Amino acid sequence: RVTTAKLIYHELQQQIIRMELLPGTPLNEKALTEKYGVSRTPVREALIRLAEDRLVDVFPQSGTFVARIPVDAIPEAVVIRQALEGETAERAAANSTAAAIEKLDELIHLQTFYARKDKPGPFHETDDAFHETIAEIAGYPGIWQHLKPVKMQIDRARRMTMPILGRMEQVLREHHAIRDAISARDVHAAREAMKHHLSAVLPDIDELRKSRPDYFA
C-alpha cells in the first residue's frame, strides 16, 4: 500500500536519479518536513532508504547530502543490464508480431521528435519506454521493473551525456538496429545489437569523470 514515506521516497529518489538534485545538494529534514506538510517521521524513513540505495550520504556531524555517482559499480551494472536486456531482446525477436513492431516504431518516431526539438528529458523517458516495450514483447515485463534499481547510476550519467552533440541521434541509430533485428526475428542479431547499445555508457563516463569530477566518487 501507498504511504507518505514511500511517496516522499520515490519523489526524492526520482529527483536524484534525474539529476534535478545534483550531487552535494544538502537535504534538510526540517525543510523537507515543512515542504511535504507531514511529520518528520516519514522524511527520516525515506532518507534512510535512499542512503541504502547509495543515493544520499549521511555525513554524521554535518547533515545529509545527495551522494556522488559511484564509479566502481558502473561496469557490473552494465553487464547485468547487458545480460537481462540481452535476454529480453532475444525473446522479443522470437515473439515478434507486426503490431509489436508498430509499437516500437511509434516510440522511435516519438524519440526522433524529442531529438529534433532538443528536448532530452522526454527523450530519456521515451528511451525507458522503448526498452520497457522490448520486455513486454519478450513476455517478461517484470524484467524491466527488475532493472530500475540496477540502472540508477547509469541513468544519472546518461542525463549528462544526452545533451552532448550527436548523442540522441546515435541512440536513435542504435534503437533502429535493435528494432530491425526484432522485426526480422533474428534472435542473435537482437541480443548483440542490444548488448552493443548498452556498452556506449562506458566510454561516456570515463570522459565525464575527467570533465566533471565533482559528480563522481
Site for Zn ion in 156-215 (CB under 5 A): none
Closer residue to Zn ion, CB minimum distance, 13 or 111: 111
Q: Cβ 84 to Zn ion, closest distance in Å? A: 14
Q: If we measure between CA atoms, which residue out of 157, 154, 163, 152 comes closest to residue 121?
A: 163
129: nearest Cα among 144, 119, 140, 118: 144
The least distance separating Zn ion from the CB of residue 130, rounded to whole angstroms, comes to: 6
> Which residues contact residue 161 at a Cβ distance below 8 angstroms, ignoring those fewer than 6 apart?
167, 201, 204, 208
Residue 197 is assigned to a ligand binding site: yes
Q: Which three cell numbers stand for residue 189?
A: 542479431
DSSP state of 131: H
Residue of closest CB approach to Zn ion: 127
The shares of helix, strand and coil residues in the chain, as percent rounded to the nearest 5, are 70, 5, 25
Confirm or deny that 127 is annotated as ligand binding. yes
d(CA 80, CA 150): 8
Number of residues that bind Zn ion (CB under 5 A): 1
Q: Is 127 in the site for Zn ion (CB under 5 A)?
A: yes
Rounded distance between C-alpha atoms, residue 212 and residue 147, angstroms: 26
Residue 214, marked binder: no
Q: By CB under 5 A, is residue 85 in contact with Zn ion?
A: no
Spatial distance between the Cα atoms of 84 and 57, rounded to a whole number of angstroms: 29
124 appears as a binding residue in the annotation:
no
Q: How far is the CB of 171 from Zn ion (least distance, A)?
A: 6
- Write down the least CB distance from residue 196 to Zn ion, Å: 11
Which residue number, 83 or 217, has a Cβ lying nearer to Zn ion? 83
Residues of the shown chain interacting with Zn ion in the complex, contacts defined by CB under 5 A: 127
Binding site for Zn(2+): which residues?
A: 127, 131, 175, 197
Binding site: which residues?
A: 127, 131, 175, 197
